[PDB]
Amino acid sequence: RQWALEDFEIGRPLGKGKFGNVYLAREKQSKFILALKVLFKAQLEKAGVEHQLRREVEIQSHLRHPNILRLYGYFHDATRVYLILEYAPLGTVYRELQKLSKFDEQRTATYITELANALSYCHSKRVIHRDIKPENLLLGSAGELKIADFGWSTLDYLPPEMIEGRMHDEKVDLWSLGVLCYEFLVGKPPFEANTYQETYKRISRVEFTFPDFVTEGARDLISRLLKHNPSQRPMLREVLEHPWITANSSKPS
Amino acid sequence: MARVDQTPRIATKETGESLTINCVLRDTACALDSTNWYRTKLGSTKEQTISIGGRYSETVDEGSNSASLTIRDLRVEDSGTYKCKAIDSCWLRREGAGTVLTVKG
Ligand SMILES: Nc1ncnc2c1ncn2[C@@H]1O[C@H](COP(=O)(O)OP(=O)(O)O)[C@@H](O)[C@H]1O
């Protein structure tokens, strides 16, 4: 704890989380604007996740990429842990989906490009992500996407190999991109059902269909990502080079 | 005076042998219980995570406040610099100084 609370001006709350609140903050020497996430130790130890979180924060502390939320540092006192985070002013992708219902092809392809860029960086360091949900994606000043949950190594977002209790590796991240590409264009994830049991079966048998408005290019990409056999999914390099992606994205690899 | 002592600091092995790396957290009651292991291949500085399984195993000793990594069936491609890094049970950052491994073969 070489950082301390006295190093920061505190402003208004940015939101409330499960184990505490997140505040707008400012580092005093540089005047740099940031977010300060305050975690209550008791809540951590109640959900039984404090040890897991310490492993995840350690991995996060090494990840430096435009589309991954930056962790600048951390410190603590008697009752609280403080994470020093990049400030993302435009909220979550989840809230944007609430406001718009679904995204056009430009916004979708741009978000998928940014995610593929981040995951390629992670794979280069042998880091993989768990499931990726819209609520776990924040938006920066230029509207660029940031992976924000520290989820490094909820049924609707899990791959067949994981719910079938089989072996898994970096290919799970390609499945995640397929589910999100579909959800961005359509407004809901592809295996959604009324019950847990139905959803499970739909995922395991890769049972999904497209609305007629989904274009041929998008259908081709989604169908390639959502293969039951992990080894049949494309490389991230192949996603970034896909003609539907290059025709619609407003950002590069 | 709290510190992690990582040994051995330098190691030379032949293809087929084994290496054990020990990381001991000294002079504190904070627990070294969350260790992640990392490697940087020879010629590079870029750090990659090590997955436990296969040729790689790990043990933890509460009495010595230590974590150990064992690599069996060493290959030439295993050569590089290994480090233990953790956030301990007191939420404090701990890192070993590194093990430079050369495998001939
Ligand atoms: N770095 C940040 N920048 C801007 N807003 C944030 C940041 N982190 C969290 N928020 C806002 O505050 C809320 C806090 O949620 P979060 O920290 O994800 O809680 P939990 O830990 O329960 O997931 C988020 O929904 C988001 O709107």
Residue numbers in the entry:
A (entry chain A): 126 to 278, 292 to 391
B (entry chain B): 1 to 105
From the paper:
We also generated a series of mutations with the aim of enhancing the interaction: Q48E, T49Q, S51D, S51N, S93 K and S93R. Three of the mutants exhibited more potent inhibition: S51N, S93 K and S93R. The most potent inhibitor was S93R-vNAR-D01, with an IC50 of 3.02 µM. Crystals of Aurora-A KD CA/vNAR-D01 S93R were produced as for the WT complex using 0.1 M citric acid pH 5.0, 20% PEG 6000 as a precipitant and diffraction data were collected at Diamond Light Source on beamline IO4-1. Structure determination was carried out with data from a single crystal cryoprotected in 30% ethylene glycol using the WT complex crystal form 2 as a model. Aurora-A KD C290A, C393A (CA) was used as this mutant routinely generates crystals of higher resolution than the WT KD. vNAR-D01 inserts Trp91 into a hydrophobic pocket formed by the αC-helix and strand β4 of Aurora-A. This pocket plays an important role in the regulation of Aurora-A by TPX2, and more generally in the regulation of AGC and related kinases, through binding of a peptide bearing a hydrophobic motif. The conformation of Aurora-A in complex with vNAR-D01 lacks key hallmarks of an active kinase: there is no Lys-Glu salt bridge and the hydrophobic R-spine is incorrectly formed.
Aurora-A is a Ser/Thr protein kinase that functions primarily in cell division and is overexpressed in breast, colon and other cancers. The activity of Aurora-A is stimulated by autophosphorylation of Thr288 in a flexible region termed the activation loop. Here, we describe the identification of a vNAR single domain antibody based on a shark heavy chain antibody scaffold that binds and inhibits Aurora-A. The crystal structure of the complex indicates an allosteric mode of action that is antagonistic to the mechanism by which TPX2 activates the kinase. In the crystal structure of the complex, Aurora-A adopts a canonical kinase fold, with a molecule of ADP sandwiched between the N- and C-lobe. vNAR-D01 has an Ig fold with two disulfide bridges. vNAR-D01 makes contacts with both lobes of Aurora-A, but does not closely approach the ATP-binding pocket.
